[PDB]
Symmetry: C3
Subunit: 334 residues, 3 copies
């Protein structure tokens, strides 16, 4: 007999986030979301390597869901008959039934509706978890995303001062395990089922072949670079459902960082690199001070440069010579 | 000339913890413990894989020792003549002589008695460390446990409020390195000595074959599941003497977490996943809100599901539909 | 038109640090440093294994630079014509142009001068980053160091009390990737260029062959052990530019630790083991209470004992029997 107002949310593909309020005068609502599972073969790198992906809403990561503390989140999970496997969903933000996993197992052709109360603030992972050895396999195949539960008064610095972001991006990092053949080339498979045996063997050795943001090498570069202007406060939500990450904004800092991702704790200030524990999401805010290109990386630099984990920001505005200047350009040594 | 009262403790096998007070009106005491080293071949998985273990008190991990700040901990370490190797003990809680290691080296047939003052609060690792390449080998063979040094006033939230647990469990995570033969089956050995060469070769490649709680795959499941009731505040002490872990209670949270394990620091609140640095112990408290099965895992899900690192909690009590409800059971898609 | 006083610093090889003030009554200055790149073949272990190193100032790590908040750091980077490759420098302490990387790319025979304002306090990594796959390779070849930006009032405990160190050491940890030949021996190369192909192949598998402090196995042991006396407060700055580390002082503690390395945040107290995220520097202070040998290690004990990551401290002073005592020396079991 829960008779609160209902509000539908139109989810958007990462790294964008659906429109929301930070601080709100709204009371609790039932916020309604729909996720549709899609299994699909995708290209994950510039050499054309393929991968048997399984996704929420067709994307890796799944879309960011945003609600406020005390809202009730009502999710319709749909597993169309064009898929081959059972799936479910586990929200780390939710309390009971294995985060909802025990109440959302659906075969192809079925859908289910789960409601949970958002009692804990922060950014949290959600992922598929359909039992036993299937749990890691579905997660590293792409079935993970995040939810952000905001305080009703918005974010604060722990010292009584509001922290308002001008925009938010969601960067989902995915460790992928693509086996190679005898000659050393990556293998392609006709189905997730067929990829399973070789993939599981590789997974158990714990070293990924690729580590990517937003599903592919170079996904957040070029035309699809993240953007900002000098003076803008940007929130970057970062998730990793299986393996640790160490985010770093090259040329900037984390001005305010919740590395464990939970807004009941004050943020740390002035970080160079932060740490996202496997199975969690964290958040970092930075006010841009300089224009130009920034790279956002995990600062295992082999992963960043060689396995796929680099995004770009293109920042517009005026160069600040007080902060940094080339005193003398490259010249022959005297 | 230390003339304080003496108190004997009867240690109990993990994941249980010997009876103790949280807040106490006792002053400092000499608390007396005995550890007896046992080298033994054990079965570590459901397929019957064997492992040359070396243990304190016959268990992996070694038992949790519990004392209060300012107590003196007096340990009798015994290395029976049925063992083959020298051993010692290093307490991370202790100050000087390599944590006691430099004062406790004993050959088979010998015992030693060490006393140290508990000047630092928290949960701390203890482990064998008998010099050079032997140090990692003895530790990953099972020779590690933990000690908890409580404040005399018990635990607090950093905001002046007492945090009292209704029960405590100790989960010791062990990375194990079992070599395989040419055909790909795990190897068995007649002695720790014989296992050394092949084991060291594998250890240096840094990828474990198994990652287990309480010594074996499935140790804390079934009849030996951890238990609680809705409304109970449970403290989970987690240690890892060699390699990082990322504990996560599936379907719950860390309400209060000391991830670095030290009670001089306020706990963080409302975590989804926490991080236990290799060579440390941490502690997390959670008040159960829902009945049913929970899994406690490291949230590298490949390790949890495929290499052995999953425990269960079975929780009794009344389901709370406000927190979570199946709005519509699995049904055919319209 | 920046007309502040100028101050030259004579850099010193790690683990020592150039003379500096903690708290200062000086106002902002332009502090001038020079770094000269050297590519060179070095011996990294006791068996005589060689490695194609690339360094700032001839050392791994590069020297620690120390300044105060609000100073301007003016660095002359020199790439002599005896080197074979372009190089640059990226300061994590600096704001804009990829930390200076985009303004400091120099071919052999060139030098450049960069100035940046030290707006953020803490210890920060600096490293070479000359684009694409070259970035990880130059960093794991040795091209990394750290800078420490002190508050003008010196360090504090977060509770209003000054924390003054009697000495500081800089420990730079380096993950190295040396390939092996068919028979299993480490390979030697005539040039960095020639080492590249085999080295990159190994790097992408993410497991180092060696993990060393100050450039070599056993660098900070023997004649070159770190030293202290009972009663001395020592600051240990630890950096790792590519891979996580878990520092631990065997027989001691971290009394005050900034594991994320940033002095805008209060230190944690009473740690056993702390965590240095890959791409960062952290700092820990400890007041020695006992004489004798301590080991400082990463507490992945396989790395510490088998791959090279152990330093020693030799501490002079009076043994404290209250803190720790051998009650009964090794004796036959009754
Ligand atoms: O946002 C969590 C807490 O942050 C801070 C405020 O003092 C408190 O009122 C608030 O509840
Ligand atoms: O427990 C450590 C500290 O926690 C808090 C209390 O304010 C303080 O009195 C206590 O010593
Ligand atoms: O050092 C950073 C801060 O530490 C503390 C002091 O209360 C504050 O004045 C100082 O700015
Ligand atoms: O930012 C969150 C933090 O801010 C405060 O409300 C005020 O200090 C704390 O109680 C909380 O942990
Ligand atoms: O919970 C431990 C914390 O609680 C306090 O005593 C009170 O804020 C702090 O000084 C300490 O760090
Ligand atoms: O030590 C640094 C910390 O000390 C304080 O200035 C006083 O509590 C804090 O504002 C800061 O985070
Ligand atoms: Cu699934
Ligand atoms: Cu999970
Ligand atoms: Cu031993
Ligand atoms: Cu140890
Ligand atoms: Cu370089
Ligand atoms: Cu960097």
């Amino acid at each position: 007999d829960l008779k609160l107002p209902r509000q539908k949310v139109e989810l958007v593909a990462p790294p964008f986030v659906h429109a929301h309020e930070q601080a709100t005068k709204q009371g609790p609502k039932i916020v309604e979301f729909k996720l549709t599972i899609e299994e699909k073969k995708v290209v994950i790198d510039e050499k054309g390597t393929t991968f048997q992906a399984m996704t929420f809403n067709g994307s890796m990561p799944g879309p960011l869901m945003v609600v406020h503390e005390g809202d009730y989140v009502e999710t319709t999970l749909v597993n169309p008959a064009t898929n081959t496997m059972p799936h479910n969903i586990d929200f780390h933000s939710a309390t009971g039934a294995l985060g909802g996993g025990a109440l959302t197992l659906i075969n192809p052709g079925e859908q289910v509706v789960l409601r949970w109360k958002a009692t804990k603030t922060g950014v949290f992972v959600y992922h598929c978890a359909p039992g036993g050895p299937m749990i890691p396999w579905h997660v590293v195949s792409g079935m993970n995303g995040a939810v952000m539960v905001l305080p009703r008064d918005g974010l604060n610095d722990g010292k009584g001062h509001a922290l308002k972001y001008d925009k938010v991006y969601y960067v989902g990092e995915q460790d992928m395990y693509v086996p190679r053949d005898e000659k050393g080339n990556f293998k392609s498979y006709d189905s997730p089922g067929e990829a399973f045996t070789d993939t599981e063997e590789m997974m158990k050795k714990l070293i990924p072949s690729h580590v990517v943001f937003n599903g592919k090498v170079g996904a957040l570069t070029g035309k699809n670079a993240l953007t900002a202007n000098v003076g803008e406060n940007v929130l970057i939500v970062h998730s990793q459902a299986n393996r640790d990450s160490r985010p770093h904004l090259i040329g900037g800092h984390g001005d305010y960082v919740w590395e464990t991702g939970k807004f009941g704790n004050a943020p740390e200030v002035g970080l160079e690199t932060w740490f996202i524990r496997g199975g969690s999401a964290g958040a970092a805010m930075y006010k841009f001070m300089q224009p130009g290109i920034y790279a956002y990386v995990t600062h295992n630099l082999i992963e960043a440069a060689d396995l796929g984990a680099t995004a770009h920001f293109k920042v517009e505005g005026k160069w600040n010579d007080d902060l940094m200047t080339q005193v003398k350009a490259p010249a022959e040594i005297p």
